[PDB]
Amino acid sequence: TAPDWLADAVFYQIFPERFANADPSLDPQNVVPWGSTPTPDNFFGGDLQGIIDHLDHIVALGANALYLTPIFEADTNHRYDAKDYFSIDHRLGTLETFHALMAECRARGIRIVLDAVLNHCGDGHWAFADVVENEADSAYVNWFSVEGFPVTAHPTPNYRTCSGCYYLPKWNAYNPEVRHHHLDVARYWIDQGIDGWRLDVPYFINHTFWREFRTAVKGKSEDLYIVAEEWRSPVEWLQGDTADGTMNYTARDLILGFTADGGIDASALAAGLNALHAEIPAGFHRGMLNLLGSHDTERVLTRHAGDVEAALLSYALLFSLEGAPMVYYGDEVGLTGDNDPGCRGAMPWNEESWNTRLLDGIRTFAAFRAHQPAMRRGRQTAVALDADTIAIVRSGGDERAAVIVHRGEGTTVDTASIPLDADTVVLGPLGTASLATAA
Amino acid sequence: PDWLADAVFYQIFPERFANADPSLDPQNVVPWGSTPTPDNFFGGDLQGIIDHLDHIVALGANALYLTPIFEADTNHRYDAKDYFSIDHRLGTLETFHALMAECRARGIRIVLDAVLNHCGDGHWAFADVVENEADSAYVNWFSVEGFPVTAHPTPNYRTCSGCYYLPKWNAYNPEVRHHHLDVARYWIDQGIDGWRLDVPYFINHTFWREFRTAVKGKSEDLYIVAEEWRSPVEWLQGDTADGTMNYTARDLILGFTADGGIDASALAAGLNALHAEIPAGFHRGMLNLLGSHDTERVLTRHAGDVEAALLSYALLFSLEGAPMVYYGDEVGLTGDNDPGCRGAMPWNEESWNTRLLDGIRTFAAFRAHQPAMRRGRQTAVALDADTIAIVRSGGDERAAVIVHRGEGTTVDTASIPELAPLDADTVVLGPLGTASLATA
Numbered sequence: 001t002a003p004d005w006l007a008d009a010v011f012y013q014i015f016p017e018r019f020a021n022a023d024p025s026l027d028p029q030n031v032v033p034w035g036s037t038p039t040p041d042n043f044f045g046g047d048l049q050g051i052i053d054h055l056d057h058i059v060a061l062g063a064n065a066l067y068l069t070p071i072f073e074a075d076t077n078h079r080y081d082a083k084d085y086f087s088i089d090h091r092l093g094t095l096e097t098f099h100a101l102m103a104e105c106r107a108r109g110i111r112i113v114l115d116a117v118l119n120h121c122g123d124g125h126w127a128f129a130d131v132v133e134n135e136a137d138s139a140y141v142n143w144f145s146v147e148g149f150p151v152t153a154h155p156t157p158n159y160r161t162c163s164g165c166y167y168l169p170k171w172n173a174y175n176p177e178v179r180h181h182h183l184d185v186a187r188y189w190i191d192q193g194i195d196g197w198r199l200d201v202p203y204f205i206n207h208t209f210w211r212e213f214r215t216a217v218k219g220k221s222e223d224l225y226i227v228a229e230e231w232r233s234p235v236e237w238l239q240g241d242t243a244d245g246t247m248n249y250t251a252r253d254l255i256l257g258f259t260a261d262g263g264i265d266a267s268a269l270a271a272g273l274n275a276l277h278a279e280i281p282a283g284f285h286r287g288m289l290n291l292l293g294s295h296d297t298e299r300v301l302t303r304h305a306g307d308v309e310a311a312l313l314s315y316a317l318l319f320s321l322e323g324a325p326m327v328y329y330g331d332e333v334g335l336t337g338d339n340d341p342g343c344r345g346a347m348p349w350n351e352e353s354w355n356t357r358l359l360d361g362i363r364t365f366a367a368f369r370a371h372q373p374a375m376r377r378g379r380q381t382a383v384a385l386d387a388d389t390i391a392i393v394r395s396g397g398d399e400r401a402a403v404i405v406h407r408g409e410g411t412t413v414d415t416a417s418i419p420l421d422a423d424t425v426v427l428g429p430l431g432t433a434s435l436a437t438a439a
Numbered sequence: 440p441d442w443l444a445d446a447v448f449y450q451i452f453p454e455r456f457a458n459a460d461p462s463l464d465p466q467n468v469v470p471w472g473s474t475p476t477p478d479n480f481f482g483g484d485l486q487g488i489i490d491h492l493d494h495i496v497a498l499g500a501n502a503l504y505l506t507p508i509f510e511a512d513t514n515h516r517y518d519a520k521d522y523f524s525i526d527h528r529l530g531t532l533e534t535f536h537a538l539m540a541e542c543r544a545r546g547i548r549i550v551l552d553a554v555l556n557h558c559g560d561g562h563w564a565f566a567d568v569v570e571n572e573a574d575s576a577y578v579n580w581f582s583v584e585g586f587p588v589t590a591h592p593t594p595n596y597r598t599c600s601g602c603y604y605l606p607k608w609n610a611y612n613p614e615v616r617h618h619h620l621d622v623a624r625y626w627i628d629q630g631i632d633g634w635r636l637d638v639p640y641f642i643n644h645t646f647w648r649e650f651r652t653a654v655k656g657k658s659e660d661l662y663i664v665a666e667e668w669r670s671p672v673e674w675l676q677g678d679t680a681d682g683t684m685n686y687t688a689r690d691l692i693l694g695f696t697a698d699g700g701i702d703a704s705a706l707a708a709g710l711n712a713l714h715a716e717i718p719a720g721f722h723r724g725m726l727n728l729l730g731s732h733d734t735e736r737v738l739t740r741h742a743g744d745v746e747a748a749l750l751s752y753a754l755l756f757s758l759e760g761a762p763m764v765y766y767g768d769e770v771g772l773t774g775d776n777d778p779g780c781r782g783a784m785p786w787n788e789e790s791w792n793t794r795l796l797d798g799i800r801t802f803a804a805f806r807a808h809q810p811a812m813r814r815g816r817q818t819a820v821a822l823d824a825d826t827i828a829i830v831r832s833g834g835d836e837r838a839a840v841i842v843h844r845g846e847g848t849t850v851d852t853a854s855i856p857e858l859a860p861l862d863a864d865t866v867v868l869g870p871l872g873t874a875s876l877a878t879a
């Protein structure tokens with residue numbers, strides 16, 4: 001089963017090169033102004049000290065865990081092209097600054113999850129450059145799958161890669177020495193104090209390796225959290241031998257279908273959510289990392305086409321579900337943008353730039369979850385009341401809660417219709433209601 | 440009258456609601472979008488009111504308060520020149536009859552403006568005194584100091600508030616009373632359901648007792664509501680009105696939802712006091728409102744904050760007494776105080792704030808559906824400096840509208856004796872959040 005702390009977790013995902021530039025002396029020569037349009041090649045100077053300095057913002061939102069995208073020495077702004085998995089990227093800070101982040105995080109009750117990019121590294125990585133250089137004489141030739149020498153990125157890479165990208169050579173995970181390096185990466189950062197690992201494109205490697213991964217990570221501690229990136233069904237990762245959960249892109253698509261697209265009505269959503277619930281095995285519901293967006297999607301508000309009230313319906317649903325809810329940095333203040341690089345805009349720190357009522361609306365849903373124990377540990381039941389209105393009921397030992405979410409122009413619901421209370425509740429246009437009762 | 444318990448009012452300033460008949464339009468009529476002024480005409484008409492009853496009903500209203508509609512020489516029609524005719528730009532008596540019929544067909548009631556302290560300087564009686572002086576048969580229908588009559592400097596006759604074009608009726612003349620009682624009787628014969636009293640404080644209670652007797656004599660269920668900006672207590676002794684325009688409740692609500700000057704304790708106390716001052720049987724007759732043709736528009740009072748504005752509406756619709764919506768506020772029209780608040784009502788729905796409209800409708804629908812929200816006692820309860828419950832209880836049934844002006848909070852239903860009977864133990868309120876719950 002998944003670790004129990006997860007029931008209480010609320011995650012804040014950070015793309016560190018865009019959250020806060022606290023240290024200009026770390027910035028590269030070609031650093032762009034903080035207000036610039038994000039691109040696949042530009043750098044803003046976001047750093048680890050920037051995260052430390054805004055921990056208060058992250059706490060005040062209701063978050064108690066961070067998911068960090070890659071932070072190790074790389075040549076891109078997203079850092080999926082790691083070149084040394086054993087140091088912090090020199091533009092993010094040093095190992096000391098990283099330690100200071102861990103400590104400041106744990107003084108405030110905040111757990112840390114890093115991004116484990118094990119299918120591939122960057123072409124700048126020492127082992128890969130050694131192969132380029134020394135070819136068949138490199139000791140790390142078999143750390144990759146290079147077709148022949150000389151190595152060429154032109155016209156198509158003559159080595160295996162992540163989805164054809166020339167600067168992301170694929171790690172040969174069939175090599176024991178590569179697995180040992182991958183496991184020493186897992187343990188090393190756990191030795192530095194992290195609380196879990198998020199797995200990047202885990203489906204490009206293989207279950208056998210991910211089994212060794214769980215054994216190495218859980219061997220250090222049973223409460224370290226492993227979460228699979230997965231866009232389709234999560235079930236393969238929830239058999240008890242690989243991950244503790246999945247990024248719940250299934251719930252994302254269902255929720256947004258309802259609140260933003262209008263393609264699915266409340267009945268299809270409830271059915272979608274009850275089935276995903278049936279699909280996910282016992283012990284693993286708690287481990288699902290639910291989200292409405294990420295660094296791999298367009299921003300939630302953009303998906304809702306600037307309709308902040310509808311967007312609040314999404315968050316209501318998000319915070320209502322079993323699984324740890326995750327907010328993507330800047331969505332809480334109403335940032336907009338298309339898919340990558342559009343969703344990787346720099347986070348503004350002028351409170352006059354924030355959509356404050358969006359922030360307070362999300363804070364409210366988070367606060368009700370944190371205060372009501374059934375919202376964290378209770379059972380999840382989804383029920384349609386009409387085409388535009390859904391109730392997410394959560395059933396605790398000694399208490400029960402419901403979040404009722406209406407996307408129409410207003411209605412009333414008889415709670416006697418939802419299997420403790422016989423109240424009538426009214427919902428305004430784009431309205432929600434959040435109710436609890438002693439059992 | 441009992442029917443006031445279920446009444447919801449929609450106030451129309453008839454010049455500005457809807458212009459259905461261009462043939463009625465005056466010569467220098469302005470475009471419908473234009474800025475209102477003390478002299479301009481837009482051509483709003485009675486047929487335009489008939490044509491838009493749908494919108495009124497969809498709002499949830501079942502009663503109109505109309506401002507004066509008799510023949511006059513201003514855009515506001517407070518300067519009546521003939522009390523026994525519809526103003527020629529509004530329509531004819533026939534059209535008026537048609538509006539009544541249509542209204543009766545939808546269970547809508549009608550309330551007109553009784554402007555009895557004064558008429559207009561163009562009124563036939565006044566012009567006859569101006570012409571024939573001491574030989575006019577109507578010299579004592581007014582208070583003219585002497586001849587020739589002059590406005591020039593300042594009127595050498597009594598007026599409403601110094602205004603030369605609004606000479607004051609001598610209500611001490613039985614002929615003038617007779618005339619006033621014929622006006623009340625005449626429009627009641629034309630199908631009308633009641634009267635709003637314009638500045639009744641400028642006349643006297645002896646006159647308003649006769650007024651009541653004549654009106655109630657036609658039918659006990661005809662409603663009488665007095666304009667009063669201060670305490671309403673003097674109008675509620677059983678001998679004059681059935682209620683007043685509740686400007687006291689307005690000042691309290693807006694001080695809390697818009698100004699920030701009054702907190703929830705002070706608002707709860709204010710409302711509880713007002714309630715206790717209102718005599719038994721008269722709570723329902725109170726005509727509750729957030730604004731009128733004599734105030735700046737609600738949304739403008741809330742500095743354009745729609746969510747703040749919706750807190751006002753929630754409160755308004757939660758109170759005992761008949762709630763009234765000033766035409767166009769439901770769609771988010773803005774405006775300063777008169778003339779600014781007499782904008783023409785746009786009918787192109789792309790200009791409306793429809794979340795505001797549907798917000799108001801929801802409060803109305805809750806109230807229409809809950810018997811306690813109409814006939815139940817009223818207890819106002821401060822929970823926080825920023826959060827108030829208005830509770831309504833029918834014997835053992837209970838409704839509650841909870842209204843939060845802060846950034847978000849939680850309402851523990853237990854430990855609040857008046858909220859305790861709801862099965863829900865906790866209720867969340869978002870920022871500027873509203874919660875409406877009812878028992879059983």
Ligand SMILES: [Ca+2]
Nearest residue numbers: 460463482484
């Ligand atoms: Ca007209």
